[PDB]
């Protein structure tokens, strides 16, 4: 309740505490890659960066609210997790 989004919590007043075929979606068939063609232009620690595991793996699509009244599951308040994989954060 007191974390980020406390303003929303206080305003609410809660106080406890065939077109679906895989090819259609391949980005060769969905991207104007012609624009890229350049015409007359003018490891002990990781070598590559580490991607957001939640974006790469998690089903964030399950947080889309398709119908406000008929919501298939019950959502819960989210706690701040302060991922330390991201640089630019002191801790």
């Amino acid at each position: 309740r007191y974390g980020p989004a406390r303003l929303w919590y206080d305003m609410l007043g809660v106080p406890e505490d065939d077109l679906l075929a895989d090819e259609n979606f391949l980005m060769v068939t969905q991207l104007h890659w012609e624009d890229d063609i350049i015409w007359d232009g003018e490891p002990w620690y990781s070598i590559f960066p580490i991607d957001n595991e939640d974006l790469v793996y998690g089903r964030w699509e399950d947080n889309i609210i398709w119908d406000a009244q008929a919501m298939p599951r019950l959502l819960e308040p989210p706690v701040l997790t302060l991922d330390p994989n991201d640089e630019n954060l002191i801790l």
Binding site: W8, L55, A68, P78
Partner: protein
């Protein structure tokens, strides 16, 4: 719950003060259900002098008025100011409690300091209530953690985008878009935005959702902060602003339609800047939009959001997603040119869907057809998309003339 009596072992102790050596257990049971019966008849008759003489305390003059009532001789010496003392005696196997009475020299009661003389009963009048509440006269009762700098910056920036005035909002969004050091406050902003878009389900506020989408659009324009680690939170918030069905409090007059195309432009930008082949952001966004559009039973608002996002993704997407289901326009015009219920809310959403569809499919028809387009509208569904395509070809010719 049960009839409670004095213990039977308390009568063996009493019988040995008398001199009775052995008393059998059926005699001790015969003694204790009588003396605990006479205790309850003076406990309840002392309570009749505590209640009729209004006291709620049960002083020892109440029991003495009840022993006088049952003809039994009084108990002398219980009106003096005493209390309940008991003194434990351990002993070599005999456990008991006694009084340990004390003595006092007789001349120290003849020469005690006398207490002060009592006062006589008098009367006093005062108002308790004067046509209403009580007066206030004295005869009445009286009646990892953000530093303070950035904590203050977070508070001011978030409360500037809740809607008190527009100028502070514009300066707050121009702060978010153009400051160099706002990292370490990006997770707080992402949590604030995602929870605030969630709080739309309790209160269908269109205005606060427009403010949160302008907060996301300002967060994207910041060159210094990288939203790659927090995009998994901002994607479903903008998706919720696109494909949810009730975006309005009054569905008929609120233009949920603009928070639709604004958030659709926003998600096209969020999957242009961040889609990588490890991410699969754009393919997973197109798949959600596609299975929300092709599937029937979906409301006209969420179909509008799906078509809006798919048509803001680009030209090849509307070639390979929108154009196969152009026959669906006939299913739309089933409920527009001929509806049994005209005064419902399906008609405004249906012809909004129609206008968006033919506006976005006019350049797609201008790309993959002949230059003449004589009866393409007749060949098209409802003959209207074809008129829009002719208008689009005319607009393209005008643009070429301007060039």
């Amino acid at each position: 719950l049960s009839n409670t009596v004095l213990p039977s072992e308390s009568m063996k102790v009493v019988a040995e003060s008398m001199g009775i050596a052995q008393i059998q257990e059926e005699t001790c049971q015969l003694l204790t259900d009588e003396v605990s019966y006479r205790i309850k008849e003076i406990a309840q008759d002392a309570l009749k002098f505590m209640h009729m003489g209004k006291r709620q305390k049960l002083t020892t003059s109440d029991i003495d008025y009840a022993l006088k009532l049952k003809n039994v001789e009084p108990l002398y010496g219980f009106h003096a100011q005493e209390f309940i003392p008991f003194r434990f005696a351990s002993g070599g196997g005999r456990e008991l409690y006694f009084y340990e009475e004390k003595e006092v020299d007789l001349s120290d009661i003849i020469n005690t300091p006398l207490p002060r003389v009592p006062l006589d009963v008098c009367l006093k009048a005062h108002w308790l209530s004067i046509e209403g509440c009580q007066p206030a006269i004295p005869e009445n009762p009286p009646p990892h953690e953000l530093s303070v700098e950035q904590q203050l910056y977070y508070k001011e920036i978030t409360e500037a985008c809740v809607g008190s005035c527009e100028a502070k909002r514009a300066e707050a969004l121009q702060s978010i878009a153009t400051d160099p050091g706002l990292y370490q406050m990006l997770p707080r902003f992402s949590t604030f935005i995602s929870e605030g878009v969630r709080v739309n389900v309790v209160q269908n506020n269109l205005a606060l959702l427009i403010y949160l989408m302008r907060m996301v659009k300002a967060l994207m324009d910041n060159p210094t902060l990288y939203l790659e680690k927090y995009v998994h939170e901002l994607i479903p918030a903008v998706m919720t602003c696109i494909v949810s069905r009730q975006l309005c409090l009054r569905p008929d007059v609120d233009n949920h339609w603009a928070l639709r195309d604004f958030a659709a432009r926003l998600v096209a930008q969020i999957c242009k800047h961040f889609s990588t082949t490890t991410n699969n952001i754009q393919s997973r966004i197109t798949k959600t939009f596609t299975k929300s559009w092709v599937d029937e039973k979906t409301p006209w608002t969420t179909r509008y959001g799906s078509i809006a996002g798919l048509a803001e993704l680009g030209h090849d997407v509307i070639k390979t997603l929108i154009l196969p289901r152009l026959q669906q326009e006939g299913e739309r015009i089933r409920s527009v040119l001929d509806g049994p219920v005209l005064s419902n809310i399906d008609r405004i959403g249906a012809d909004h869907v129609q206008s968006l569809l033919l506006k976005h499919c006019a350049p797609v028809l201008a790309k993959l057809r002949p230059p003449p387009d004589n009866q393409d509208a007749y060949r098209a569904e409802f003959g209207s998309l074809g008129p829009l395509l002719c208008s689009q070809v005319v607009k393209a010719r005008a643009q070429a003339a301007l060039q």
